[PDB]
Amino acid sequence: TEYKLVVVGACGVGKSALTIQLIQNHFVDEYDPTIEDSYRKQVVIDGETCLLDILDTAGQEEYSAMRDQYMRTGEGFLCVFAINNTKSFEDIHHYREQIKRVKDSEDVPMVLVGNKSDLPSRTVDTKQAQDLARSYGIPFIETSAKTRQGVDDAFYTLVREIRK
């Protein structure tokens, strides 16, 4: 069963590192910030043999029909910010609104992801992020691509939401 997932958020939050942890089970601390591609992973989720097709976004900020059609292929979206970057969290509402527009839906499967949870000096609090996820009616997952904390929780929760 195929699930088309899209990982979005400001560049530098760890979209690539999270995707590589899921696919390859290791931390890649350096990955060209301009590389945008789809990566496939066969995994078992709640007994179902899944094919995850994950689009790790980069590109340009472009509101063309071509880019909208490309993003519209996504079934579920991980909206990622970094816990030590207030700007990336403030940007979440823009990503949520563009997803809602291209999918033409108020309940697109989404998970709010607070990455870099291994770091000791945060600027965005768990309470404010939990509250934003509550405003959207979506789950909030704390992750670390460095340690693998929350990686399956984020992706598998998104699959469960698509499956529902």
Ligand SMILES: */C=C\C(=O)N1CCN(c2cc(-c3noc([C@@]4(C)CCCc5sc(N)c(C#N)c54)n3)nc(N3CCN(C)C[C@@H]3C)c2)CC1
């Ligand atoms: C690291 C790579 C890089 O240089 N960039 C440039 C900045 N950039 C970017 C993209 C977006 C943005 N807004 O929506 C999207 C997605 C990818 C989200 C899913 C749905 C759709 S439909 C569609 N078309 C697009 C696109 N593009 C999307 N990406 N926003 C921003 N900014 C930064 C400036 N700020 C005032 C507004 C917004 C938060 C930047 C791409 C990565």
Ligand SMILES: Nc1nc2c(ncn2[C@@H]2O[C@H](COP(=O)(O)OP(=O)(O)O)[C@@H](O)[C@H]2O)c(=O)[nH]1
């Ligand atoms: N400490 C820490 N650094 C991370 C984590 N995820 C990514 N990084 C770092 O954050 C930067 C951006 O990562 P990258 O995967 O390129 O993010 P992207 O631009 O969103 O694809 C790099 O310096 C990574 O080493 C994480 O969970 N913890």
Ligand SMILES: [Mg+2]
């Ligand atoms: Mg990247």
